[PDB]
Amino acid sequence: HKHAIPANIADRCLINPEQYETKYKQSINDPDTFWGEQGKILDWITPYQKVKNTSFAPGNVSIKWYEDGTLNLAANCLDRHLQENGDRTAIIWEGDDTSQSKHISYRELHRDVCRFANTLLDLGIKKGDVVAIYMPMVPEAAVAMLACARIGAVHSVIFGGFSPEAVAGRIIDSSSRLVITADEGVRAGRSIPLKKNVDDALKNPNVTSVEHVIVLKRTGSDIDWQEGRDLWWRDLIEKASPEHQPEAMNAEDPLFILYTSGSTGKPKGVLHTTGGYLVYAATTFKYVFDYHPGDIYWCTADVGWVTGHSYLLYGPLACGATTLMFEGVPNWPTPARMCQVVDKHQVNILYTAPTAIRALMAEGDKAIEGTDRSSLRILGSVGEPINPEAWEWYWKKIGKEKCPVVDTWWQTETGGFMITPLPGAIELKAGSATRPFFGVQPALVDNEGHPQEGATEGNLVITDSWPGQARTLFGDHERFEQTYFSTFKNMYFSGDGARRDEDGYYWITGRVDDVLNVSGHRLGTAEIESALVAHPKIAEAAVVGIPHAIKGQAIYAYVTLNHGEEPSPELYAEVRNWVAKEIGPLATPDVLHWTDSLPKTRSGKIMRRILRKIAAGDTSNDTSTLADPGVVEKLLEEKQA
Ligand SMILES: CCCOP(=O)(O)OC[C@H]1O[C@@H](n2cnc3c(N)ncnc32)[C@H](O)[C@@H]1O
Q1: What protein family is recorded?
Q2: How far apart are the CA of 493 and the centre of ligand 1, in A?
């Protein structure tokens, strides 16, 4: 059953049950009045008059919010906080090594953002240029992102764990003019070779657009240097003026691109504009985490993911919050690390991932030994379904049974929270994301697109726009419409399945398309398959996900070798290492299943449902449409070994 709203939260909450009901209704009945007023969470240089201007219609997918208005993201996240709060900490940085930490005030962060903005301008970067950021979890990554946004450059942040090949791919598609990186990242007492990875990427003959690499000397390690191209971060920023006046950007000027894995093909650049995105990030942050001035807030997500964009940086700083950036991992040196960070910086709001929760839960009270945790008032969960038992352990052990847990469902494409509890408004069910946010109209449809009413399950769609919605796929608006708006006409299709219960609470069950969730990472089965087939011994591959107690899903790859090739344990590790090279360690198959028995239909289609079942440990329960039905038996045998 339900968790009641505690008394401490009821007494302070920004949105109560009744305000949620009232605001939700208006957001839906009158978007223009609702978002017109809510848009004032931001400072606008010239005020908007238009609010909502959107369509999901076939051939006319067009999303626009606050369009005739102008603003600066960096002014909203920095400059406007200066007069009264310049001395308030903007970012608490906690090093992988706990002996290393910083408190960076709004004034401090502003100064460096201005210097770096000038640094970028002097290097020839202009409004609209794409800048590639390949950084570890250090404050300079934020400086780099905020400075791009200040001058209307379009940053494209590349998760540090991506391979040189994956970096090349993102740089090529985006025509990035500059790469910003560090010599090495530090994670769990170990180096990560970032700049070296950038060198390798830039040797790709198809990379033609990068003019400079800016390098942060994080570790001081010996690295290669290309004279002319490579520039030290300190060398540049020390030469730069701390004076920079922000220019008005139009609400619909592109702000960033984020490569995101899909059901088809290689990752695409999901694009966000400026006004609606930032309004939505600030609004969701404030109401869902119940942010009050003085609250120390910690989102654990990496900067290279949308959660790190919206909920580490943009949402929090637009609201004048203290946000915490942690360089390392929540269980190094010990499982208690996460709660040690909480104690050390008196974190009041913690927002993390079920993969982490499961990792700490496996260690039991080792995750909490010698720690206090009393500063916490709110907990959050993101990025993957959370099982009830994990949710209960998190609520009990980290939250001391005193903290609401906000399970926030959303996606790169949605820009901010979509279905989520509000801590003082909505009673909680372990495992449920609960109710839509203001502006969000979800529905469940069957495979044919008939809407399902009452307590039911189906494909999760959103039937109208909301300020934070992604506007396009970089350089390919037609693929944007086809990818999201063609399956169920006039609706945004998320690619998730969900059930809705008798209370109207949504329970998100995961992707219904060919998209995996591995340790919280969204990866397409097809991109793993291509990476596998690029191997000169591999003929065919079929990749499925299997349940995994820790990772949520593990990657299971059926692999057909070229005629004349035999498997080995040598080849096992080789092929795993090959995928880690093609994409990154995050996409390394957990299982390689050597076979010549892929179930192909008369047409040649791969019978993917059978492969899924077999990989999952099913041994029983159509084979008639199938060239050689005997493959199923062979597949089972091989699985049993
Ligand atoms: C939210 C930041 C991560 O965004 P990405 O675009 O990388 O992945 C979005 C997908 O993560 C899952 N997902 C995300 N949050 C939840 C969630 N809270 N519950 C269940 N599944 C979730 C859903 O399948 C979704 O389609």
Answers
A1: Belongs to the ATP-dependent AMP-binding enzyme family.
A2: 13
